[model samples]
Target: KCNTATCATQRLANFLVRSSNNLGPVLPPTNVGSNTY
Candidate 1:
């Protein structure tokens, strides 16, 4: 059920959906988006 891309897409979807109502704090203003997800 999961190639690398498939796993990643599904995982991301799961994360977004599960956290839709409660997204975490915006990563500190110090660090950018890289390596954060």
Candidate 2:
């Protein structure tokens, strides 16, 4: 059931998993926007 929302989250999950592997469990740079969170 890869609808629009499912596809979107799947992409996000893919990116997160990939980057986490490279960055060692840290969030990716794009998610560090403004560092205000």
Overall lDDT per candidate, in order of appearance:
0.64, 0.66
Model 2: CA > 4 A from native = 1-7, 25-37
lDDT for 29 (candidate 2)? 56
lDDT of model number 1:
0.64
How many pairs collide in each candidate, listed in order?
0, 0
Worst 10 residues of 1 by lDDT: 21-30
Question: What TM-score would every model get versus the actual structure?
Answer: 0.29, 0.30
Candidate 2 clash figure, as a count:
0
lDDT per residue for candidate 1 within 1-37, as digits (tens), equals: 4667667778677767777555545555555655864
**Which clashing pairs does model 1 show?**
none
Q: Against the true structure, what is every candidate's RMSD?
A: 10.7, 9.5
Once superposed on the true structure, which residue ranges of model 1 sit more than 4 Å away at CA? 1-7, 23-37
lDDT tens readout by residue for model 2, 6-36: 6777867777767768656555555655567
Which residue pairs come into collision in candidate 2? none
Q: What's model 2's overall lDDT?
A: 0.66
